[PDB]
Ligand binder design. Structure first.
Ligand SMILES: *[C@@H](CC(C)=O)[C@H](C[C@@H]1CCNC1=O)NC(=O)[C@H](CC(C)C)NC(=O)[C@H](CNC(=O)C(C)(C)C)NC(=O)OCc1ccccc1
Length: 180
C-alpha cells in the first residue's frame, strides 16, 4: 500500500510517455532536463514526449568500468521546464526490498501498477544475448511494452524495467552516481 501510494505520486510528478522509432516507453525525468530510458529504446535526435516532439541534446548509453552493458540510456532534453529533482530517491548501490511496485505509463498500459513483491540483486545476466550487469530481479509475469516501467518501494526508486521472461522480470538498477 505505501509503495503504491509513493509510486502513484512519483509517476504523476516525474514520469511521461515517450515514443522513439523503436517503440513507446515509460520515461522517468530525474533532474534538470536529464531523463532515463531502457537502452533498447534507442532515442534518436528527437523523441515524442507526451505526443510532442522534443529534441535530444545528448544521450549516454551506460556501461561499467569494464564496458559491460547496464541497459540504460541517459538523455538530456531540449526543453525549458525542469524535472523535479528526484536524485535523493536514488540509492548509491543496488537496493533489495521485500515489497516493490512496478509502474508503467504508456498508451498500451495507461497508469498501471504491478505488485512485484521481493526484489533481489540479481547482478549478471545474459540479457537478450548481451552480458549485462546490475540487474534487479522480481517474480512476476511481465510483458513486452513494460520496459521503461519504474521499479519502486516506499521512498525508493530502485530501477527501470528492461527485460524478462516466463515469470521473472529484471530492472537495471538506477544509481545515484549515474547523475553525478
Ligand atoms: C521491454 C522492451 C519492449 C520492446 O517492449 C521488454 C520486456 C520483456 C518482454 C518479455 N517479458 C518482459 O518483461 N524487453 C525485451 O523484450 C528485452 C530486450 C533487450 C535487453 C533489448 N529482452 C528480454 O526481456 C529478455 C532477455 N533474455 C532473458 O531474460 C533470459 C531469461 C533468456 C536470459 N528476453 C526476451 O526478450 O525473450 C528472449 C529473447 C528474445 C530475443 C533475443 C534474446 C532473448
Amino acid at each position: 500500500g505505501p509503495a503504491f501510494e509513493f509510486a502513484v505520486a512519483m509517476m504523476k510528478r516525474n514520469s511521461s510517455t515517450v515514443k522513439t522509432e523503436y517503440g513507446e516507453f515509460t520515461m522517468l525525468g530525474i533532474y534538470d532536463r536529464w531523463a532515463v530510458l531502457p537502452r533498447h529504446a534507442k532515442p534518436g535526435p528527437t523523441i515524442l514526449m507526451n505526443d510532442q516532439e522534443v529534441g535530444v541534446l545528448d544521450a549516454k548509453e551506460l556501461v561499467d568500468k569494464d564496458g559491460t552493458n547496464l541497459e540504460l540510456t541517459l538523455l538530456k532534453l531540449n526543453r525549458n521546464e525542469k524535472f523535479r529533482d528526484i536524485r535523493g530517491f536514488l540509492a548509491k548501490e543496488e537496493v533489495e526490498v521485500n515489497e516493490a511496485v512496478l509502474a508503467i505509463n504508456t498508451s498500451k498500459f495507461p497508469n498501471m501498477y504491478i505488485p512485484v513483491g521481493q526484489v533481489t540483486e540479481y547482478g549478471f545476466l545474459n540479457l537478450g544475448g548481451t552480458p549485462t550487469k546490475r540487474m534487479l530481479m522480481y517474480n512476476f509475469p511481465t510483458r513486452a511494452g513494460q520496459c521503461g516501467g519504474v521499479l519502486m518501494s516506499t521512498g525508493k526508486v530502485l530501477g527501470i524495467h528492461v527485460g524478462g521472461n516466463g515469470h521473472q522480470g529484471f530492472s537495471a538498477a538506477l544509481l545515484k552516481h549515474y547523475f553525478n
